Ligand binder design. Structure first.
Ligand SMILES: OC[C@H]1O[C@@H](OCCN2CCN(CCCN3c4ccccc4C=Cc4ccccc43)CC2)[C@H](O)[C@@H](O)[C@@H]1O
Ligand SMILES: C1=Cc2ccccc2Nc2ccccc21
Ligand SMILES: [Cl-]
Ligand SMILES: [Cl-]
Ligand code: NA
Length: 472
């Protein structure tokens, strides 16, 4: 039983637009902040790589569907490129080519028995909106509503699973470093919090829009995908446990407390630590923006499920470190990783499968067991088809998730592996491989070929259980 997926549980794979599509300026698509980063700052990216072509999924989407069908995916999670649909960011111009592309992909999926799950925003802000300041500028919340209206109107007759945002915890960091994630702006501890505030407002507007203009007719579900690492106390002390709770609240709670709790608002520890630090540093005003009571009420409850992106764990101990100002410093935890944990091709990603179970329990207890869809989980190597590390990563994480479901009563409702194929890995370019299908980026045809992990995942999806040879 503990090794069998619940009957209604949905299994599949995931991608993101800038990581796979290419066709960056084709057929009316406008420029986004990743076009800007990779074109103007190739020194920020391994090998000076760009997403100009990537997997060429703009042209090769039928090949993506073919491999999803081979895999036996029930659901395909992909994102829509805002600037492909609204090249100016604002909703004055709708690019028919973009509408046609996503309709073509959606229709191809449905014709092959695969359910689309659509992420509205996976990091590729139109440059015209970044030029207003991007996410720190609250005017983007209304622009995001207008973008979502276009998506619901055009695609919502066939798409019933939506994520507003993918991982704002990471993309807010684009406002916390001059050399980091797009748009690579150095306002740590100030502009990143403003970005979060706008994103939360935007999410809430999109959810209310769906309620008001679309839900009765379309009958779908709207969530948000949040990334979170497990944070294990470095020692069993109360003080180290406190630091791990700080981590959860500063990383997951930042977004989930306003939306998924009955109280709403930011977590108290976030408000209080930033208020105190801001006062101590001489600011008249806290660096953390505030919600009014009306806004707290508007934002809370804006969810039909919680998307979780889970990759790894950290150790947390009591203390403070980091630059002043920064969210890491504000969070009041000292973070490390255990040298004993298996490594990957990514410095940040260690293999800690039991952390996944711990995290799912933390979520269950904090948010009253919301339906959880695992929207990303995966592993990096530098290449190769005999990807035993990736196979072990998946089988262990799926086992731990299944224990969370069956032994712990966590309401996990689906899982999409990250990623369907090797793709443009942001600042890491093509140097880190997260796919279950390999892609030859030196071959203009970009063939997708299955790794051992794709074969094992196909076996899991077909049999609906963990094969015996991978059990404890
Ligand atoms: O990357 C795979 C997938 O990630 C996913 O983000 C979700 C996963 N992202 C979240 C953002 N994350 C940043 C991690 C910070 N990182 C460092 C920060 C600053 C300096 C140096 C560092 C080096 C090592 C570190 C060690 C310990 C902690 C943090 C470290 C990369 C993984 C994403 O949604 C997919 O699009 C993507 O393909
Ligand atoms: C991020 C900020 C830090 C600031 C100050 C002390 C320790 C830090 N932790 C880090 C270790 C390695 C890379 C980046 C880090
Ligand atoms: Cl201990
Ligand atoms: Cl066997
Ligand atoms: Na339209």
């Amino acid at each position: 039983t503990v090794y069998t997926f619940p009957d209604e549980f949905k299994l599949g794979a995931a991608t993101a637009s800038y990581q796979i599509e290419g066709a960056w300026d084709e057929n009316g698509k406008g420029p986004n902040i990743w076009d800007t980063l990779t074109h103007e700052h190739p020194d920020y990216v391994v090998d000076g790589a760009t997403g100009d072509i990537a997997d060429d999924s703009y042209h090769l989407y039928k090949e993506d569907v073919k491999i999803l069908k081979e895999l036996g995916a029930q659901v395909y999670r992909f994102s829509i490129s805002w600037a492909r649909v609204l090249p100016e960011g604002h909703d004055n111009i709708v690019n028919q080519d973009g509408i046609d592309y996503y309709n073509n992909l959606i229709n191809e999926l449905l014709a092959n028995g695969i359910e689309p799950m659509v992420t509205m925003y996976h990091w590729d802000l139109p440059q015209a909106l970044q030029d207003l300041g991007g996410w720190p500028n609250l005017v983007l919340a209304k622009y995001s509503e207008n973008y979502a209206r276009v998506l619901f109107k055009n695609f919502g007759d066939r798409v019933k699973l939506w994520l507003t945002f993918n991982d704002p915890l990471t993309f807010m960091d684009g406002y916390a470093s001059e050399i980091g994630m797009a748009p690579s702006i150095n306002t740590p501890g100030i502009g990143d919090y403003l970005a979060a505030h706008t994103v939360i407002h935007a999410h809430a507007r999109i959810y209310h829009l769906y309620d008001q203009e679309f839900r009765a007719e379309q009958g779908g579900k709207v969530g948000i995908s949040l990334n979170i690492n497990w944070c294990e106390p470095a020692t069993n002390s109360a003080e180290d446990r406190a630091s791990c709770e700080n981590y959860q609240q500063f990383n997951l709670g930042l977004y989930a407390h306003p939306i998924f709790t009955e109280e709403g608002d930011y977590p108290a520890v976030l408000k209080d630590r930033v208020s105190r630090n801001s006062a101590d540093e001489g600011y008249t005003d806290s660096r953390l923006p505030q919600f009014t009571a009306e806004e707290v009420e508007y934002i809370r409850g804006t969810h039909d499920f919680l998307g979780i992106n889970f990759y790894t764990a950290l150790l947390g101990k009591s203390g403070v470190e980091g630059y002043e100002p920064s969210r890491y410093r504000d969070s009041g935890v000292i973070l490390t990783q255990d040298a004993a944990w298996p490594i990957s091709a990514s410095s940040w990603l260690k293999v800690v499968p039991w952390g996944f179970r711990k995290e799912l329990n933390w979520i269950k207890n904090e948010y009253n067991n919301p339906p959880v869809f695992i929207t990303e989980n995966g592993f990096s190597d530098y290449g190769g088809l005999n990807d035993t590390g990736r196979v072990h990563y998946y089988t262990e994480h799926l086992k731990e998730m299944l224990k969370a479901i069956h032994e712990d009563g966590v309401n996990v409702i689906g899982y999409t592996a990250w990623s369907l194929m090797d793709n443009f890995e942001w600042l890491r370019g093509y140097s880190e491989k997260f796919g279950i299908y390999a892609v030859d980026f030196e071959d203009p045809a970009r063939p997708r070929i299955p790794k051992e992990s794709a074969k094992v995942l196909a076996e899991i999806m077909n049999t609906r259980k963990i094969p015996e040879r991978f059990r404890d």
